[PDB]
Design an enzyme around this catalytic site. Structure first.
Site, PDB file in Angstrom:
ATOM      1  N   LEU D 248       0.892  -1.274  -0.093  1.00  0.00           N
ATOM      2  CA  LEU D 248       0.017   0.052  -0.067  1.00  0.00           C
ATOM      3  C   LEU D 248       0.893   1.323  -0.034  1.00  0.00           C
ATOM      4  O   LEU D 248       0.484   2.288  -0.615  1.00  0.00           O
ATOM      5  CB  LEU D 248      -0.855  -0.195   0.988  1.00  0.00           C
ATOM      6  CG  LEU D 248      -1.595   1.268   1.470  1.00  0.00           C
ATOM      7  CD1 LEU D 248      -2.487   1.341   0.309  1.00  0.00           C
ATOM      8  CD2 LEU D 248      -2.469   1.183   2.623  1.00  0.00           C
ATOM      9  N   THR D 251       1.220   3.384  -3.402  1.00  0.00           N
ATOM     10  CA  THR D 251       0.388   4.494  -4.033  1.00  0.00           C
ATOM     11  C   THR D 251      -0.383   5.310  -2.767  1.00  0.00           C
ATOM     12  O   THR D 251      -1.322   5.831  -3.060  1.00  0.00           O
ATOM     13  CB  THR D 251      -0.664   3.644  -4.769  1.00  0.00           C
ATOM     14  OG1 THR D 251      -1.279   2.679  -3.689  1.00  0.00           O
ATOM     15  CG2 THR D 251      -0.153   2.846  -6.012  1.00  0.00           C
ATOM     16  N   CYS D 252       0.138   5.162  -1.680  1.00  0.00           N
ATOM     17  CA  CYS D 252      -0.743   6.031  -0.519  1.00  0.00           C
ATOM     18  C   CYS D 252       0.437   6.508   0.644  1.00  0.00           C
ATOM     19  O   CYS D 252       1.048   5.456   1.365  1.00  0.00           O
ATOM     20  CB  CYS D 252      -1.600   5.139  -0.107  1.00  0.00           C
ATOM     21  SG  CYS D 252      -2.545   5.771   1.530  1.00  0.00           S
ATOM     22  N   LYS D 253       1.015   7.537   0.278  1.00  0.00           N
ATOM     23  CA  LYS D 253       2.123   8.255   0.893  1.00  0.00           C
ATOM     24  C   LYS D 253       1.922   8.910   2.457  1.00  0.00           C
ATOM     25  O   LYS D 253       2.831   9.184   2.859  1.00  0.00           O
ATOM     26  CB  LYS D 253       2.885   9.246   0.249  1.00  0.00           C
ATOM     27  CG  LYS D 253       3.141   8.621  -1.381  1.00  0.00           C
ATOM     28  CD  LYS D 253       3.995   7.363  -1.247  1.00  0.00           C
ATOM     29  CE  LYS D 253       4.361   6.741  -2.698  1.00  0.00           C
ATOM     30  NZ  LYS D 253       5.597   5.895  -2.448  1.00  0.00           N
TER      31      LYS D 253
END
Ligand SMILES: [Mg+2]
Ligand SMILES: [Mg+2]
Ligand SMILES: [Mg+2]
Ligand SMILES: [Mg+2]
EC number: 4.1.1.46
Lengths: 339, 339, 339, 339
Positions: D248, D251-253
């Site tokens: 994850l 794409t999810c910082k």
């Protein structure tokens, strides 16, 4: 985790008062020797604690009972001057880590105003911190409160300098001590007596019109507001629906909720409870809450491990941790202030 | 909406004390004529209110300051006896709607114990309600507290009869009033002074070992606990992590949370705040919270419209509204008790 | 510090399913090798964790998706019987520390009722735990919900045996997965999809009258109730003030708050948040909340360090930690059950 | 009591769609004739409600399911253009009382971006409001989600214009309706299905990196955030401690709490619960909460009597009632905007 936090109920004592410091520590510390070292140290141990726990900036103040314990007005004024001179020199070692509150003799409003002015103008102090009423009279058994017209000259000085006033507790003494506390002595201090003093004094300022005559005055209470947010509903009800029908409105022009929105601040000193913090966010609002520790009566570890890890939305952790105080005290850059 | 509620901080006064009643009303009522009628009435106005607002049963008690204002012990004891005989006769008219708490002179432990026993054994009173400390001394400037070994005989009578003791506030008088309250007199009563008195007394009972010597004793506080739930974290911290390492554990064997789970109750009297109730449910638990009104200082409409309409889970509305009190006071049958 | 806690959303898997276990661990574990060992172990690692963290008793259940993933009814039923016989053997090693929930094929109401009855009557199982709907149809793309009249014989069996039913989540599959979750797959499981399934199914039981036909039925949801307490106000409003004036009242006779007071329970599995717990105490009531862990997807350390150290009144810590489950599951004594 | 409030989940419909309006009202209104007049009225009934309840400004939007129900892209685009032209003219009647959100066909990212730009640049619309996914495919059984790179051109237009996007719910249709909702149809809409759609879509935007590629993007959710704040702890735990070790993080910082501090807003539409508001103030922060009504599915009376009278500190009543929205939407003065 959060860096650049600001703490502002952080005490020091003069080295020459070690015997007084050890007596106070015998009531309120379980490690008096460390307490003495920590309350006297400014620039080494205190900095190490702050570096370990993400505290960028601390506004320092004199320990309780401090100058308010001194009922000789000549001795009290000399001690306040000596204390302010001393801490101004100590904080020169680390100005991007430390500021200071003025310490005041509160025997005389004009004298206190002039010393606060000297502190702000000469040393750039951020406000005043006073330990509740000033002892006065023969054996120091009288109490000087500041919620009356004699003190208008002092509160006007506060708003002209545009600096807040932190109403800190002190211990009960003399007649009040013997009648109420001596027979239940373990309740002295943080368990109960401290909050009883501060809440009485600040709500006296409310009901005697101090914030009506000085609407820009900022007053700060530690310990999540010294019980007052618990009774926000009940105080407001008994003001607006009872006492203001009987005479209170003559000297009290706004609601208790107005004064908490406009004049009064609370800090988290000595009250590391997320459950109580959440309740205070409802009753007072996160914009009016400031992180603080109450060092060295409380540890950096306790306060900062709580606050850094408490379940809290990121907006309010940032405000309570530092942004509220940066705006209130008009702070320029300090260590990690934008980290 | 909810029917069969129980309220238990509900005051009456004797007709012959109208002059004192009107003075008290001048401090705490905005409609003195209605107050005089309502505080004196038992069986008409009070019943009409209760019928309109789903109150099945009320435990009545004598108004403040009551017998605790009377510093002559012979006069105080005679008045307590007169009051108990009077209310016992009044509540026989509607026994499915009314019970009573004992009214006591608290000058002498054994005398108070004997009058409580008479009230319970002869009249079936449900416990005792006392307005904080007993005034004593030549002109009433002394205070008798009950958190010491002299009162063991009294507290053992409470647990032997298995009835609770309601610690109600009273006004500050004499030296305390002049030193702390006279210059901020609008804070006297519900705004601040009441809770300062009761919290001091009950936490004195905690820290002087009363609940250790009498582990079955039940003590009730009004007004959602007179600030104590707000400081549950802070009191527990300064007991367990501080004072209990300095000697307090020798006379205080459990935590403050233990004493709220085992001995102490709070009521909703005069504190009609769902936000604060929710916070008290977290800090003390819904099993330990009782509905009450504080009539006629508060109105049935205010208390019951709030509680009947408050957002609350159905389990706790039932417990707080009546089932907690039904169990504590062994009340199995009264008007709408199963509605 | 609390001992004798009860946990009851605690999963095991059969050793012969190592691959399915590893696939499921690839979605929900960061340490697959430990996960395989912990989910298959019953009597050593599980006991070690419990002894270190004050867990006296655990009710074990089969891992998700478990039997609900099996759309061949013959294979599904055989696996359920195999699992129940297996775990009954395993818990006889440490019967004072473990109970078990029935694992069921839910293809046929009569068949599921008969196997539930076998588990309770023969093995003394405590209830049933089922992972949401039963996959069915030729490719497993159909869903069997239990909120209709076909399942009355099953729900009547739960109430006859007086054992609860735990509605555990399972993963989205087939058409539902493709249309809603494939393009945002990181939301599968605890982040979102799990709660969407369980809340749909339990609120379907509410609105299709299951608790009206079976008012003694006890249904348990993990994860603090799968979002439902957040919308208790909104659901109640849109039932009582909207849908129940348009037809819902024909099949739904009580309020959503009534069903949470009488039929529905929530656990703390996988939701170690004191702030959310407090909110749930307000919206559902501490009487209806059970401690649980969600091991081995969550750790004993996370769940138990949270619960043991959470700020909570002693009454509710005792209830949520063990006393609620002790009464609900009619438990005899177990290790530290009254410590 | 509070004046000048802003509401922004306030729907209208075109008069020529009365048949479809009455069908929708048959599902979600208990007074269809009033609903029909109120959902089409802009300048008479709506203004009278706002004048009686202290609402100074409303941002209007097209009713659900609106354009998202239209799977013919030519038809959908023509209707969006027609609706935008229509409401721009209607708000000319009372420009100090009304603004509007753009209504959009979301079949094609560039087409939607261009129509949003037209609405902002030509009419001064305040943002977009879209009813969840866009129906598409031959029979409208497909769903177009916006949490992917094809929509970067649209989200970049939102941030270039610096206007927010309100993700409103819509009803389940087609295969999703038949598989999940038809057998429990009373859960369709506010009780459950609405929140399931919106939370899925917005958490899709989170985990598919939309807010990483467009960090200035502001997204609004109604109904106090469609369950998401309840699971803030659980989502954050399963992101940061689980899924972000499995892919994850690619794409999810940021954390979910970061996105609620920087990108996501919630409103009080249809969720008039102070207990839940307080919890959302803990989990999301009062700075990120906007007052709204959901008229005419909710009444001005319900929403405004709640909010005007809810127990709440004065700071946050002002921010949530109007000051947050004044800053977010860069509003000029409107009726009572500084009252
Ligand atoms: Mg301090
Ligand atoms: Mg009273
Ligand atoms: Mg689980
Ligand atoms: Mg809406």
């Amino acid at each position: 985790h959060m860096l650049g936090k600001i703490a502002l109920e952080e005490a020091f004592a003069l080295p020459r008062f070690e015997e007084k410091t050890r007596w106070w520590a015998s009531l309120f510390s379980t490690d008096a020797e460390t307490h003495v070292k920590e309350i006297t140290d400014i620039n080494k141990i205190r900095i190490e604690h702050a570096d370990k726990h993400g505290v960028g900036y601390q506004i320092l103040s004199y320990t309780a009972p401090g100058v308010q314990d001194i009922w000789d007005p000549v001795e009290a004024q000399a001690l306040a001057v000596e204390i302010n001179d001393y801490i101004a020199e100590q904080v020169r070692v680390n100005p991007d880590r430390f500021g200071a509150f003025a310490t005041l003799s509160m025997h005389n409003p004009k004298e206190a105003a002039d010393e606060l002015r000297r502190c702000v103008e000469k040393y750039g102090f951020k406000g005043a911190l006073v330990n509740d009423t000033q002892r006065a009279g023969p054996d120091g058994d009288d109490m000087i409160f500041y919620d009356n017209a004699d003190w208008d000259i002092f509160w006007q000085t506060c708003t002209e300098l545009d600096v807040p006033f932190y109403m800190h507790p002190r211990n009960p003494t003399g007649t009040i001590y013997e009648k109420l506390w001596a027979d239940r002595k373990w309740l002295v201090g943080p368990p109960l007596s401290f909050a009883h003093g501060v809440s009485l004094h600040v709500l006296g300022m409310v009901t005697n019109g101090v914030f009506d005559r000085h609407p820009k005055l900022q007053i700060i209470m530690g310990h999540l507001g010294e019980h007052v947010p618990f009774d926000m509903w009940r105080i407001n009800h008994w003001f607006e629906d009872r006492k203001k029908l009987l005479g209170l409105a003559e000297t009290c022009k706004k609601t208790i909720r107005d004064y908490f929105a406009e004049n009064i601040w609370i800090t988290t000193s000595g009250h590391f409870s997320t459950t109580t913090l959440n309740f205070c966010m409802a009753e007072v609002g996160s914009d009016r809450i400031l992180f603080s520790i109450d060092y060295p009566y409380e540890t950096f570890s306790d306060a900062c491990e709580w606050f850094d890890n408490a379940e809290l939305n990121g907006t309010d952790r940032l405000k309570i941790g530092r942004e509220n105080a940066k705006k209130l005290f008009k702070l320029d850059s300090y260590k990690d202030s934008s980290a």
